[PDB]
């Protein structure tokens, strides 16, 4: 996370730390499911990978001490394409814990979204993560607060750069080329989190998915709302 601040204990109690092919993030759903990005498990470019998953603290060293949480199962969404370099369609996956976690003040799941107003122009949301800072590595969770961006303007920007990346209705974009705040390497798989103004319930509206570089652009996120049925169907127990 660039241009962010240190998270305090209890701020983002759903946040997950993974170390599969490198650092990444996720969000607790229920007491035994982790939502994240599929590219975190099946990377684009490319050593052989363990499902390492730590929960329940903001300090990377304390998270590790609390112990790994073994993954019983993985579901990658059928539309994801590992081999296509500029197409993050369906960049969403689901990890099932072998054992459910006990909930508390520092460990609580995030809700899923139920309507399209979570994606309105200028709605502010939060991205927390253990990813890289502008000039150094992060040893604690950090976060930024970013506006949902006009997807027409995001298109304009990709086009000005002559990029042919898939930018679909199952993705949205946040931040702004003028803003320093963004996700970076290690933040992928974390959620873009919106506090419903009418309800005070926190909701995972997106998953940190892709961009061009890090700061000072638009970031792209998997539109969680469009997979809520698929998520619910995999959690069906």
């Amino acid at each position: 996370i660039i241009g962010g601040q240190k998270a305090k204990m209890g701020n983002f109690p759903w946040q997950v730390f993974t170390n599969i092919h490198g650092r990444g993030g996720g969000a607790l759903l229920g007491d035994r499911w982790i939502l994240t990005a599929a590219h975190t498990l099946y990377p684009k470019e490319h050593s052989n990978a363990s499902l390492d998953v730590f929960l329940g603290h903001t300090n990377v060293e304390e998270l590790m001490k609390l112990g790994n949480h073994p993954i019983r199962r993985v579901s990658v969404h059928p539309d994801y394409r590992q081999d296509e370099s500029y197409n993050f369609e369906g960049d969403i996956a689901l990890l099932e814990l072998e054992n459910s976690v006990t909930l508390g003040p520092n460990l609580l799941p995030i809700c899923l979204p139920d309507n399209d107003t979570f994606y309105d122009l200028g709605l502010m949301g939060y991205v927390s993560g253990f990813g890289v800072m502008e000039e150094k590595i992060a040893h604690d969770l950090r976060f930024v607060r970013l506006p949902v961006a006009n997807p027409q303007a995001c298109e304009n920007w990709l086009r000005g750069k002559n990029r042919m990346d898939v930018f679909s209705q199952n993705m949205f974009c946040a931040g702004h080329p003028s803003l320093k705040q963004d996700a970076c390497q290690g933040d992928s798989g974390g959620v873009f989190a919106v506090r419903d103004p009418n309800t005070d319930r926190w909701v995972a509206t997106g998953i940190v998915s892709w961009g061009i570089g890090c700061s000072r652009g638009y970031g792209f996120y998997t539109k969680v709302l469009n997979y809520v049925d698929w998520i619910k169907k995999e959690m069906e127990e």
Binding site: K8, M9, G10, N11, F12, P13, L29, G30, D31, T102, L103, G104, P105, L108, P109, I110, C111, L112, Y126, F143, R195, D196, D200, R201, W202, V203
Partner: protein
């Protein structure tokens, strides 16, 4: 020859169709009042019949009716229970109320209030609505206890 008139040992034993005389080959059944069970030594009985044998003696000695005990209530994952009734007493008519570890879990629902379980005549814990099956506590999502922004009166 006739057998002695049957002999109740406590207030909770019933003798069905008590006969004025009892002769050879006759029998009587003993049962209990709602919520009590037949006991003989340290052993619980499903039924009791005494048979008047050819020598004027009952083949078997009158049991007792002791209050039924439902046992320790089943544990509730991510919850607990409190007694509305004497602390620790798991006997007939005892009452407990299950509850969940709020605000982190919430009791699954649907007619409140009913995490309520009384220890019934059948000697098992039961809820009016739910029956023998215990409640279920479910994760509560999106309600951080130390949130970064939150609404305020």
């Amino acid at each position: 020859q006739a057998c002695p008139q049957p002999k109740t040992l406590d207030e909770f034993t019933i003798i069905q169709n008590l006969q004025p005389q009892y002769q050879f080959r006759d029998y009587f059944i003993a049962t209990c009042k709602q919520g009590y069970q037949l006991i003989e030594g340290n052993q619980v009985l499903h039924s009791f019949t005494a048979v008047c044998q050819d020598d004027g003696t009952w083949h078997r000695a009158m049991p007792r009716c002791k209050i039924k005990d439902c046992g320790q209530p089943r544990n509730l994952p991510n919850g607990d229970f409190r007694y509305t009734t004497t602390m620790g007493v798991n006997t007939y008519k005892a009452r407990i109320q299950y509850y969940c570890h709020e605000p982190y879990y919430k009791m699954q629902t649907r007619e409140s209030e009913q995490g309520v379980y009384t220890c019934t005549a059948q000697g098992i814990w039961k809820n009016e609505q739910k029956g023998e099956k215990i409640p279920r506590c479910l994760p509560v999502c999106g309600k951080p206890v130390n949130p970064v922004e939150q609404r305020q009166r």
